[PDB]
User: Fold Platelet endothelial cell adhesion molecule from Homo sapiens.
Amino acid sequence: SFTINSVDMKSLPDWTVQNGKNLTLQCFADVSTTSHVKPQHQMLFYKDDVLFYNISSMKSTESYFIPEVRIYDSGTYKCTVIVNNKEKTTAEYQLLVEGVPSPRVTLDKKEAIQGGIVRVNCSVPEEKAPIHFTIEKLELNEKMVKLKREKNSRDQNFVILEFPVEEQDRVLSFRCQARIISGIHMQTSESTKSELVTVSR
Ligand SMILES: *[C@@H]1O[C@H](CO)[C@@H](O)[C@H](O)[C@H]1NC(C)=O
Ligand SMILES: *[C@@H]1O[C@H](CO)[C@@H](O)[C@H](O)[C@H]1NC(C)=O
Ligand SMILES: *[C@@H]1O[C@H](CO)[C@@H](O)[C@H](O)[C@H]1NC(C)=O
Ligand SMILES: [Cu+2]
Assistant:
Protein backbone atom coordinates (compact mmCIF):
# COMPACT_ATOMS: atom_id res chain seq x y z
CA SER A 1 0.00 0.00 0.00
CA PHE A 2 3.14 2.19 0.04
CA THR A 3 5.36 2.57 -3.03
CA ILE A 4 8.49 4.69 -3.09
CA ASN A 5 8.61 6.09 -6.59
CA SER A 6 11.99 7.82 -6.72
CA VAL A 7 14.72 8.71 -4.18
CA ASP A 8 17.18 11.58 -4.55
CA MET A 9 19.95 13.54 -2.95
CA LYS A 10 20.95 17.15 -3.53
CA SER A 11 23.76 19.33 -2.28
CA LEU A 12 23.53 23.12 -1.89
CA PRO A 13 25.02 25.15 -3.61
CA ASP A 14 26.45 22.45 -5.83
CA TRP A 15 28.27 19.13 -5.94
CA THR A 16 31.36 21.15 -6.55
CA VAL A 17 32.33 23.74 -3.95
CA GLN A 18 35.11 26.09 -2.83
CA ASN A 19 36.98 25.00 0.27
CA GLY A 20 35.60 26.73 3.35
CA LYS A 21 32.09 27.57 2.16
CA ASN A 22 28.94 26.38 4.03
CA LEU A 23 27.18 23.21 2.59
CA THR A 24 23.89 21.34 2.86
CA LEU A 25 23.05 17.74 1.85
CA GLN A 26 19.46 16.60 1.34
CA CYS A 27 17.92 13.12 1.06
CA PHE A 28 14.32 13.37 -0.10
CA ALA A 29 11.87 10.74 -1.31
CA ASP A 30 8.66 10.58 -3.29
CA VAL A 31 6.19 8.07 -1.93
CA SER A 32 2.67 7.35 -3.22
CA THR A 33 0.05 5.86 -0.91
CA THR A 34 -3.59 4.91 -0.48
CA SER A 35 -3.25 4.72 3.25
CA HIS A 36 -4.46 7.41 5.54
CA VAL A 37 -1.55 6.95 7.85
CA LYS A 38 1.54 9.10 8.37
CA PRO A 39 4.54 6.99 7.38
CA GLN A 40 7.83 6.81 9.18
CA HIS A 41 10.95 7.61 7.13
CA GLN A 42 14.50 6.64 7.83
CA MET A 43 17.21 8.45 5.97
CA LEU A 44 20.73 6.95 5.90
CA PHE A 45 23.70 9.01 4.70
CA TYR A 46 26.74 7.25 3.23
CA LYS A 47 30.09 8.75 2.32
CA ASP A 48 32.13 6.12 0.44
CA ASP A 49 29.73 3.41 1.68
CA VAL A 50 30.14 4.36 5.28
CA LEU A 51 27.17 5.51 7.30
CA PHE A 52 27.58 8.91 8.82
CA TYR A 53 23.97 9.96 9.49
CA ASN A 54 20.99 7.90 10.54
CA ILE A 55 17.75 9.79 11.05
CA SER A 56 14.13 8.80 11.43
CA SER A 57 11.53 11.46 10.68
CA MET A 58 7.90 11.98 9.66
CA LYS A 59 8.81 14.27 6.73
CA SER A 60 10.06 12.77 3.43
CA THR A 61 13.14 14.98 3.17
CA GLU A 62 15.91 15.50 5.65
CA SER A 63 19.08 17.49 5.63
CA TYR A 64 22.64 17.49 6.81
CA PHE A 65 24.74 20.55 7.30
CA ILE A 66 28.43 20.80 6.64
CA PRO A 67 29.86 24.03 8.13
CA GLU A 68 33.15 24.85 6.52
CA VAL A 69 33.72 22.25 3.93
CA ARG A 70 37.30 20.93 3.47
CA ILE A 71 38.95 18.59 0.98
CA TYR A 72 38.69 15.75 3.39
CA ASP A 73 34.98 16.10 3.04
CA SER A 74 34.90 15.27 -0.71
CA GLY A 75 33.93 11.79 -1.68
CA THR A 76 31.01 9.75 -2.97
CA TYR A 77 27.64 10.42 -1.43
CA LYS A 78 24.43 8.38 -1.56
CA CYS A 79 21.38 8.06 0.68
CA THR A 80 19.20 5.08 1.43
CA VAL A 81 15.66 5.73 2.44
CA ILE A 82 13.30 3.23 4.06
CA VAL A 83 9.67 3.62 4.93
CA ASN A 84 7.94 0.54 6.42
CA ASN A 85 9.70 -1.64 3.98
CA LYS A 86 10.85 -1.09 0.41
CA GLU A 87 14.04 0.84 0.70
CA LYS A 88 15.38 2.58 -2.31
CA THR A 89 18.80 4.01 -2.63
CA THR A 90 19.88 7.12 -4.59
CA ALA A 91 22.67 7.13 -7.16
CA GLU A 92 26.22 8.04 -6.38
CA TYR A 93 26.93 11.77 -6.45
CA GLN A 94 30.51 13.11 -6.52
CA LEU A 95 31.13 15.90 -4.08
CA LEU A 96 34.17 17.82 -5.07
CA VAL A 97 35.68 20.33 -2.74
CA GLU A 98 38.08 22.49 -4.67
CA GLY A 99 40.77 24.95 -3.57
CA VAL A 100 43.18 25.19 -0.66
CA PRO A 101 42.98 27.75 2.19
CA SER A 102 45.81 30.20 1.99
CA PRO A 103 48.69 28.92 4.22
CA ARG A 104 49.89 30.57 7.41
CA VAL A 105 53.59 31.41 7.37
CA THR A 106 55.37 31.91 10.75
CA LEU A 107 59.03 32.54 11.73
CA ASP A 108 61.33 32.20 14.72
CA LYS A 109 63.11 35.56 14.34
CA LYS A 110 62.01 38.92 13.04
CA GLU A 111 65.69 39.79 12.86
CA ALA A 112 68.57 37.36 12.18
CA ILE A 113 72.37 37.50 11.78
CA GLN A 114 74.63 36.26 9.06
CA GLY A 115 75.35 32.60 9.08
CA GLY A 116 72.36 32.04 11.35
CA ILE A 117 69.13 30.29 10.18
CA VAL A 118 65.45 31.07 9.93
CA ARG A 119 62.96 28.41 10.87
CA VAL A 120 59.99 28.71 8.62
CA ASN A 121 56.67 27.25 9.80
CA CYS A 122 54.32 26.94 6.88
CA SER A 123 50.85 25.57 7.71
CA VAL A 124 47.25 24.99 6.54
CA PRO A 125 45.43 24.56 9.87
CA GLU A 126 41.96 24.03 8.52
CA GLU A 127 43.04 21.01 6.45
CA LYS A 128 44.39 17.51 6.93
CA ALA A 129 47.60 15.73 6.11
CA PRO A 130 49.16 14.90 3.76
CA ILE A 131 50.00 18.32 2.32
CA HIS A 132 52.88 19.17 0.00
CA PHE A 133 54.68 22.48 0.76
CA THR A 134 56.86 24.71 -1.38
CA ILE A 135 58.78 27.41 0.40
CA GLU A 136 60.83 29.98 -1.45
CA LYS A 137 63.27 32.44 0.17
CA LEU A 138 63.24 35.92 -1.33
CA GLU A 139 65.71 38.65 -0.78
CA LEU A 140 63.71 41.68 -1.82
CA ASN A 141 66.57 43.61 -3.44
CA GLU A 142 66.45 41.14 -6.29
CA LYS A 143 63.20 39.37 -7.11
CA MET A 144 65.13 36.21 -7.86
CA VAL A 145 64.14 33.10 -5.96
CA LYS A 146 67.32 32.65 -3.95
CA LEU A 147 66.33 29.25 -2.60
CA LYS A 148 63.49 26.83 -3.19
CA ARG A 149 62.89 23.95 -0.78
CA GLU A 150 59.86 21.70 -1.17
CA LYS A 151 58.73 19.12 1.37
CA ASN A 152 55.89 16.72 1.76
CA SER A 153 54.39 16.51 5.26
CA ARG A 154 52.58 13.26 5.62
CA ASP A 155 51.58 13.03 9.26
CA GLN A 156 51.02 16.75 9.81
CA ASN A 157 49.26 20.00 9.01
CA PHE A 158 52.43 21.96 8.22
CA VAL A 159 56.18 21.86 7.66
CA ILE A 160 59.10 23.57 9.33
CA LEU A 161 61.89 24.27 6.91
CA GLU A 162 65.14 25.78 8.03
CA PHE A 163 66.54 28.42 5.77
CA PRO A 164 70.16 29.70 5.92
CA VAL A 165 71.09 33.39 5.89
CA GLU A 166 73.96 33.72 3.41
CA GLU A 167 76.56 36.39 4.09
CA GLN A 168 75.17 38.56 1.27
CA ASP A 169 71.64 39.07 2.84
CA ARG A 170 69.76 42.13 4.16
CA VAL A 171 66.02 41.90 4.27
CA LEU A 172 64.48 38.51 3.78
CA SER A 173 61.05 37.27 3.00
CA PHE A 174 59.52 33.77 2.78
CA ARG A 175 56.80 32.58 0.39
CA CYS A 176 54.85 29.40 0.95
CA GLN A 177 52.22 27.71 -1.13
CA ALA A 178 50.63 24.41 -0.15
CA ARG A 179 49.21 21.76 -2.45
CA ILE A 180 47.08 18.74 -1.53
CA ILE A 181 46.30 15.58 -3.52
CA SER A 182 42.50 15.78 -3.90
CA GLY A 183 42.32 12.36 -5.46
CA ILE A 184 44.51 9.59 -6.72
CA HIS A 185 43.67 6.30 -8.35
CA MET A 186 46.18 3.47 -8.38
CA GLN A 187 45.69 0.01 -9.86
CA THR A 188 47.42 -3.34 -9.80
CA SER A 189 47.58 -6.16 -12.32
CA GLU A 190 47.83 -9.72 -11.10
CA SER A 191 51.17 -11.45 -10.97
CA THR A 192 52.35 -13.61 -13.82
CA LYS A 193 55.19 -16.24 -13.88
CA SER A 194 57.68 -17.49 -16.34
CA GLU A 195 59.21 -20.51 -17.93
CA LEU A 196 61.23 -22.28 -15.25
CA VAL A 197 64.95 -21.89 -15.51
CA THR A 198 66.96 -24.85 -14.37
CA VAL A 199 70.36 -23.84 -13.01
CA SER A 200 72.41 -26.95 -13.75
CA ARG A 201 75.13 -27.00 -11.10
C1 LIG B 1 28.85 29.19 7.73
O1 LIG B 1 27.98 28.90 8.77
C2 LIG B 1 28.44 29.40 10.03
C3 LIG B 1 27.53 28.79 11.07
O2 LIG B 1 27.78 27.39 11.17
C4 LIG B 1 28.39 30.91 10.00
O3 LIG B 1 28.81 31.46 11.25
C5 LIG B 1 29.26 31.43 8.85
O4 LIG B 1 29.01 32.82 8.69
C6 LIG B 1 28.90 30.70 7.55
N1 LIG B 1 29.89 31.01 6.49
C7 LIG B 1 29.52 31.28 5.25
C8 LIG B 1 30.64 31.53 4.27
O5 LIG B 1 28.33 31.34 4.91
C1 LIG C 1 19.73 3.40 12.26
O1 LIG C 1 19.36 4.20 13.37
C2 LIG C 1 18.40 3.65 14.27
C3 LIG C 1 18.31 4.54 15.49
O2 LIG C 1 17.80 5.82 15.11
C4 LIG C 1 18.79 2.26 14.70
O3 LIG C 1 17.69 1.70 15.40
C5 LIG C 1 19.09 1.42 13.50
O4 LIG C 1 19.55 0.16 13.95
C6 LIG C 1 20.21 2.06 12.75
N1 LIG C 1 20.58 1.27 11.61
C7 LIG C 1 21.72 1.48 11.01
C8 LIG C 1 22.17 0.41 10.09
O5 LIG C 1 22.38 2.46 11.18
C1 LIG D 1 53.60 26.01 13.11
O1 LIG D 1 52.65 26.97 12.83
C2 LIG D 1 51.30 26.52 12.99
C3 LIG D 1 50.46 27.68 12.54
O2 LIG D 1 51.29 28.61 11.85
C4 LIG D 1 51.06 26.10 14.44
O3 LIG D 1 49.76 25.55 14.60
C5 LIG D 1 52.10 25.06 14.84
O4 LIG D 1 51.98 24.77 16.23
C6 LIG D 1 53.51 25.57 14.56
N1 LIG D 1 54.48 24.57 14.84
C7 LIG D 1 55.36 24.62 15.84
C8 LIG D 1 55.25 25.82 16.74
O5 LIG D 1 56.17 23.76 16.02
CU1 LIG E 1 33.57 19.66 8.63
Remarks:
- The chain has no helices and 15 strands.
- The CA atoms of residues 81 and 87 lie 5 Å apart.
- The two ends are 81 Å apart (CA to CA).
